[model samples]
Target: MESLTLQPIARVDGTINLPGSKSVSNRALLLAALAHGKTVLTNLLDSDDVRHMLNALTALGVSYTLSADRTRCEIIGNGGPLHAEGALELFLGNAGTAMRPLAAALCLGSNDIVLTGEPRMKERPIGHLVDALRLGGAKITYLEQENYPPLRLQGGFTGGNVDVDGSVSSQFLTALLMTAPLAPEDTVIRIKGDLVSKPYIDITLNLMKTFGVEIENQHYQQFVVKGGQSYQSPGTYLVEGDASSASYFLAAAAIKGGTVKVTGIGRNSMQGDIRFADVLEKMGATICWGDDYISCTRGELNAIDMDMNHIPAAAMTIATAALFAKGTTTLRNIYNWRVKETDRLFAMATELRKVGAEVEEGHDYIRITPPEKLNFAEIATYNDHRMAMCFSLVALSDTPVTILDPKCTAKTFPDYFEQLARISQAA
Candidate 1:
């Protein structure tokens, strides 16, 4: 119900140190808790999603110390599945990252667990994950919908071989892989359909290796993990800056800028969304990449049509960036966008049209053509963090833009508007 108006900004020029990745932060926290030794994680994201994981870990009897800022944490690894004397209830909010992975991880123990979340969480599909876990001898039942969240699990996953459909959400496969090492028997996971967001699986596998657990990935089609393998804590881990969060600032620079350099993620970054800079390059933006940072500057922006299935979250920034482009930009193979924080495809189409853009919202794709003159409008954020952040780019136009429910950004980037203020000069 609260709205913030952003006046048009002429330029964006500054250095931004990105926060820790939500995907990596939650995965590392869980793996660190499951590892054999103590783990200290630095630069952890302080957001709703990560908080859900930390809170759930506490309820599951995992002991850990968090710094005052919540960006640093020291976790005492249980070296195995979580142990609690009685039935445990974990309210995971609407974080799919926490819900799916925790669903798989909890099954490694014998604790009676109930995983519930906000109303929207129940709408997102969890059946694929439950199906795969059930195949691996996990006893899970939906308390409400057939395939949705609010689940009850009698923890016991005797892993063998299981088939999971990957076309929907990659989080399901990520959940299975993170817990596969703790299964009683060896786990071989086969993908039933072409995987969407395949790069996210790489993040999962890489983080698992960082915790001293290795998975054999066969061409992104199958994965093999030996059972009874335990994670070994690396003692200290530094979470990289969120590549998805960087998309907003990076796109801002490309739209209008002197230059904007974002540190924390760079050439050596493991996040797939880091490739978002490459997309900007293809659009004619001048980019300079370093081992630990990337800088972007303004250029004659042109529209592009590409399959952005690999980086769905970061690709949302491109939708708004299209407003400054010369032609229509088409983003394809993003059907999963409908199942994210909100129905992103529909939400984006509706919001872009409000700003005078010609938008064609397809089943799995969107074509955006910039209007000759931008319109002044209030952008509805749909309680989606990315929506608020992405639409902020409209401020770079000649007209001011108002963002409805701007605080929705707390789901991931809590200081998003503040960070934008640091780099923006008023028009």
Candidate 2:
């Protein structure tokens, strides 16, 4: 349980039905809880991140029943903002999705709510979000550190013009968008800088429309939403498969596959991570796409220089695949990686070097060059799920890879190693 050693894999060939998307699952759960009717959500992701959202919802007095497998959920909607009997504290374990949005939602009504999380989560910045929310009359104080979590949420968001810095995480803007419609007046949100992960805001807007709330968006700079509105549940909401989770398998095929097919999300996924396949294709991997499935085959993988801001999680997979590439691969505009589960840029550079790859760690980017041959080394996961899943690609080479704290994948893809095993054949 301390670590897992993956032997060198000669070939990868199989089909994997991916779990539901954590982003969509959490968003849908929160929206359903705030909506005006019953919602039957199928294929909800059963993972640590989603569990944090569900547990927080329970604490806030939103009622929902889960199936035995925990992937299907039926919720009795609150028809408005959530409320509890008295003061409460929520422990969200490194789930940015839960902590950020709930920070905004709990602010829609007056309540004593304290949002705290894992140590790493406390290190992640909530100041931008706090600053934006403060403009809307939200009273949130940093309990442990400035610009971090352990937020004391004293709900008082009146929601009228608010500007959020967009250079950091898009979740701050997303939280504002989700809570704005419930405020006492029309909400106008302005962006102070270029929005990183621009597509995620699209996902948020798309999902909000699906839940029957329409906002006027102006060139990604500002948004206007009518207040005193309620979310309308669609009755049955089906969560799409996680496109980010599919990255590892797709990279596996590109590195050591006869062929590997991942069924769940494809061209039409709401997740921005789906675009990672396009990067694979550009790297010479033969990619096949369908409405709900994507497959990959072996290719003469080459290095690439790309701005991976849109698909940060999937971009990590590219860093590992770079180990098999012909030239130096550079990923740009990923400053947010420093604010994730760990200082991902540093962790990635350290682990890639341990495996014999030359890595350049930067303030906002990482460049990797494959060695003529890799070295055997233990990869530290840093308790980051993507770090664990991404480095699994090292096993595709002749080098065996050992992943420390492999269970860290429970944050999003709990069965990642098992699923990889189903499709991997040792040399």
Candidate 3:
């Protein structure tokens, strides 16, 4: 479809069974592939991002079976580093989760491997990760632009101590941590700068433990892992619902309240984006948290100035939720947004302006002042899934909003519009 016009929604109230988490699904798939036993993963996300990881695993000669719906997967573990017959190149479309971790995992094997991705993925920086891998005795070279993807790896990682800059993206650290256990010797990683998305590191550490590998986390300053360790399948790994994807529903309830309840992730969710609920609570939403569910009800919305670096991906929803708030909402300390699927900081600012918002775009922050009356306009999604999903919240206003290239949401949430339709009531 060229575009989707969302009529103004009068109320948003319902329970949504969120799809499996893209982050957890990809990570579990990789770890499971490296383990010694079979892994039955349930609630695995069936999306473009997860498909990239699955397809790469297939290319590398790992075997896995998927149920008809593609949500349940049984991966036959290879027990160690992936082995391929000869030179191989894996194209990981714009899935950052697949590209970063796979680049590191493939280094532990003894084969020539090339990691390439979509056009935008070529623009994403992977130099920090490659530099860290090189220091640990992994032979890797940039096949294209410096500090970006399309890397050539002469696999062999005899790990030691390496310092990785953490200011750019947390995935660099996550990629290193996930692959650290397979290094030939003990691996110690030191953080070089203030780590952005600190909560995501927590997700990495917590999930690594689930796959039977433990790393000594030194207060997020350093990570120590003994090499020659292996990931042991938990037999059945049930992925939590995507907390990031749930942000849209939670924000929708806060905007056009009836009471929106989302299942899959809850109060004790491991994903960092779960903290997005707290940001909503701060905005005056009445939030209820259950063990495996979170619900939100409408409240008098107020703008808040917050440092949203820890939940950068989920923070994008706040940019649009600001339209329903009084005063101006400021999201600060997220300069890394420039390096995401798009220049998200600029994109959010530009799109928010189209809906009659006064936006101030900064180096790492965006301040959005809601217009007295929102203007009806078509939102361009820039081939970014979050962009399409986030702007859908604009329909809560008096103005009906249109989303261009709405299919871009297939990257993460293919059924997003259909799901939204179930709970949305016209004004």
| TM-score of candidate 1 versus the correct structure, residues matched by position | 0.98
**Minimal lDDT window, size 10, model 3:** 80-89
The weakest ten consecutive residues by lDDT in model 2 span 81-90
TM-score between candidate 2 and the true structure: 0.98
Encode model 2's per-residue lDDT on 1-427: one tens digit a residue.
Answer: 5999999898999899999999999999999999999999998999999999999988888889999999999998899998753458899999999999998888987878889989899999889999999999998888888999998888899988899999999999999999999998999999998899888998898889889998999999999989999899998988999999999999999989878999989888888998999999999999999998999998879999999999988999999999999999999999999999999999999999998988899899999988999999988999999999999989898879899999999999899999999999764
Residue 235 deviation, candidate 3, in Å?
Answer: 0.7
RMSD of candidates 1 onward, in order:
1.0, 1.0, 1.0
**What does the lDDT read for residue 158 in candidate 3?**
81
What TM-score goes with each of the models? 0.98, 0.98, 0.99
Runs off by more than 4 Å, candidate 2: none
lDDT per residue (tens digit) for residues 1-427 in model 3: 5999999899999999999999999989999999999999999999999999999999988999999999999999999888764558898999999999988888885769888988999999999999998888888888888999898888887899999999898999999999989888999999997888988888888888998989898999999999999889899989999999999999999989889999999988999898999999999999999999999999878999999998999999999999999899999999988998999999999999999999999998999999999999899888899999999999987889999999999999999999888789764
CA lDDT, every prediction? 0.93, 0.92, 0.92
